[PDB]
Amino acid sequence: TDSIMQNYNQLREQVINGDRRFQHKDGHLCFEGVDLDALARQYPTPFYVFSEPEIIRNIHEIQQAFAAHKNTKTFFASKTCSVMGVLKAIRDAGICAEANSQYEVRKCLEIGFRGDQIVFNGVVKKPADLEYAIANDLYLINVDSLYELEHIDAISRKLKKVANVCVRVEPNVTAFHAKSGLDLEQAEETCRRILAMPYVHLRGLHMHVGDQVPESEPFAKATKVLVDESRRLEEVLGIKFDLINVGGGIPVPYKYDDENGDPLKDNMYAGITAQDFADAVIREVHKWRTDVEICIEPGRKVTGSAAVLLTEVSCEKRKTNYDLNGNVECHVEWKFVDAGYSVLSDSQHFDWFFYVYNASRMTAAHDAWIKLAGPLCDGGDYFHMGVKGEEFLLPKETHVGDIVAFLDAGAYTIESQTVFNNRPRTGVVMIDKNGDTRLIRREDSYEDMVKYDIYLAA
Amino acid sequence: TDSIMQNYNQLREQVINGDRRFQHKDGHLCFEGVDLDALARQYPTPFYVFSEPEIIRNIHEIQQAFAAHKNTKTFFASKTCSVMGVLKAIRDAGICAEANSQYEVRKCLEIGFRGDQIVFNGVVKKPADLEYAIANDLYLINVDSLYELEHIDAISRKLKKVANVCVRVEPNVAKSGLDLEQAEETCRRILAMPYVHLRGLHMHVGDQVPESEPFAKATKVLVDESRRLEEVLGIKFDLINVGGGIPVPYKYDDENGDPLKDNMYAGITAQDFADAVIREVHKWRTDVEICIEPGRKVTGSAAVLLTEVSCEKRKTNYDLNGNVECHVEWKFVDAGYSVLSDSQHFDWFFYVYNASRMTAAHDAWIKLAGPLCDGGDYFHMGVKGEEFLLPKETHVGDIVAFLDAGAYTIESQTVFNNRPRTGVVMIDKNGDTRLIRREDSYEDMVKYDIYL
Ligand SMILES: Cc1ncc(COP(=O)(O)O)c(/C=N/[C@H](CCCNC(=N)N)C(=O)O)c1O
Ligand SMILES: Cc1ncc(COP(=O)(O)O)c(/C=N/[C@H](CCCNC(=N)N)C(=O)O)c1O
Ligand code: NA
Ligand code: NA
16 A cells, blocks of 8 residues: 555656656646646636647657558547547648548548548448448448448449448457457458449458557457458459558557556556557568558547546545444545546546546645545446545645646547536647647537527526 | 247237337337337437326326325436426426536526525535525525535625525435534534525435335434434424435336346335335424435436437357357447447446337347447347347338436437437427427537637
8 A cells, every 4th residue: 555655656756757748837737838737727627638749749659650561541530539629630740530420521521631531430321421421532431231331332323433442340259249340251242242333442351459459469360360361352352452451449558657567457558559559460461462551540549648637626525434333434535526427438437547646736745545526416426446446646735626637538538528417518728739728629508508408498 | 038038028018008108009119199110200310209298197106105294395306307398397297406516507497497496416516506506595505515515604695695505414324425423513503604594404315226225214314313403403494305216117027126136126116215204204293394306216217219220230150160150130229328328337227129110029139239439339238138139020220219218318428429419309298299409410519619
């Protein structure tokens, strides 16, 4: 325990000393030079702040990782974060976009990605979705089922417009637990049929291994399956594929003290780098072709490390358990923040760990065990992914009005919010390349929330 | 397995032959005389349909349960569902409202609940929230901490307006409430505050509680301490507020269920809840007001999620190596966990039927997936393990129904993958339908962002 506390304050000092994102000023956590205590006095909490410089650094990591293969194309999985200002930053950094719904395709087109910079994935692509995608000449539509393929044939014919497709294959219980992709056994006939379709153009095969995968071997195994079948089909069908699409899954470090962690038992430890992901993928593709295009679809890695959730300590209490004779059994120091699981979904629903610190007292020892609660009704709306069990460490002097920061809060955190208890979804602030801040998403207002309803005011 | 299938089809026939909510017509599931296959051709799926008649039936069950105690006040816990048209139905049915945020208070006031019909609960009530509540003369603010109480004292003094409070106590038979040990001094201090009026004590046991003993024991704790404080402080309390938690049946075949291990079986009824509460309160006072804050029981049974079967596939495991070992039939609906949150995040069971083929045997084992990216976006709370039963005749374009989908299902939606949050339709008391919430539009989604 004392060791756990000691280790946590070693990590705290690494944040403000040797982290490319963070500094401190006046004892306050700073992000790209921006004082986060002061920022949280200018915008109402809770809100997220994103760093454009850190997104750029992440994208460079990915792109540098694939230097051994010139013919690589990188599509940001916009399901990770599709706030328009974030997408615009990713476009400016020079990569492309991946989309999982009609409205995702549309927003990518709106913000400036060309059709030939967009890949459309999904297990459900209704005819209206497919018609929209085909009419906008998307780079790829990644076909997930034979039923969807029938619609692509019929709609491409209606539009007299070529649909460019990959066939998604499940490289692997995966009949019972994997809803996506075709069985490998079905790729050959599926491809044979596409070749014969006048307006469907087979570009390659697709797979996606998973999310936050903390080892290289699954990527290597699955890529080899895809590569072996691509090679075989080239011979059997007498074709040359343009590409292979190996998906996403590059992990992000959510716990940084790798010496104390096992990525195979706790995948908050990232286990591998973008370079290890590239090495595994490229090695398997080059056993087939060095010239073929490799498409990748990273999501999490582009934005995960590039935002902080800022939330104000809004209440406090001590709760005491007594035996049946009025004698203290134990005290619990509860701190309440104005963000709960409706603001940070994965902390609750997917047992996700984020570093928690007192951004107003970043240079103070984090030396008191506390429990950290949200504002929702749910008895379960408190943060259970603690430093030790369900307990967090904050400075003993923590006060109502301090600002708490959750780090590594940029992946899958904005669109997954709700208005449970009619608490609004949060504003979002962006730090640009010059270190200046601006609001890029408003907090939901009272009006915004009732406007969807149809009713007579009393 | 053959017995699980027979039992499920027994339940299916009971839906369309012996359920006050449902009928069949032309092979289709009907809700209060409305053909749901036909309804889902008028509005884009997925969407929720609510029944005002069922809300009324549920409220009647609650109020009848408390007939032995004349002075009972019922507050709908609006966290359960605050679509304005649902709140209006509940207001028009004659009960009161409970709120868990400033904007919930405001929407309750805007739909027509008076201040004296609103209770404000919560572990975080900031000064701005408290000021709004006090200024609007709320019936109760249920005090959760000593920190909050100091703001209430200060703000009520500033406004020169009386704040009506309960003290929430956690009976330790958890983040909310004060310790019982703190009630006496807290009440003593509230009595001395010039603009705070102490109404009583408050508790809330939990959600979907499948047994009466927790309520009886928790109520007795509050009654005993209420009785004691009346003596010690020389006062008569206005009320006792015993909270919510009346369960709703999510599985109906009670003969096959253990509610204490699987709380999708309700275990008790509103009458059992009332009997326990009234039995304890009446050891002390018959004249005192009992406040109750039911949420789930008011609306849970009163909605259906309608979702179109939008894709299908067969996945075949060839021996783990080679040779057909088993086929898995996947059916994809256009609602996933961003539409029906508790099915995923809280392991919640909802009955699933093919509403387009409700009179057909549900004779085929399938797995039921949503449309999201997440490999985990499929429905795992099946009829048998993760498997569901639908007619072998099920086709893309059929309408699947999730029953009992009225509690905690609307405000918990997300726009993950930029799929819109759903529209909501209401069947009114005359059996007519209207849209009471639009589906989010594309324009809705991007309008919150600030961009060029
Ligand atoms: C075809 C495809 N291409 C790329 C990605 C990008 O994955 P990455 O962000 O790099 O881990 C995904 C991701 N899908 C989902 C995320 C789920 C996130 N869920 C969550 N609760 N945060 C999955 O792999 O299950 C995908 O489906
Ligand atoms: C003070 C208070 N008064 C009444 C209720 C109404 O409870 P009822 O709906 O009847 O079970 C609650 C309910 N709060 C929460 C629901 C949580 C629902 N969460 C969900 N994911 N569906 C709780 O008891 O944890 C409450 O906090
Ligand atoms: Na073709
Ligand atoms: Na007083």
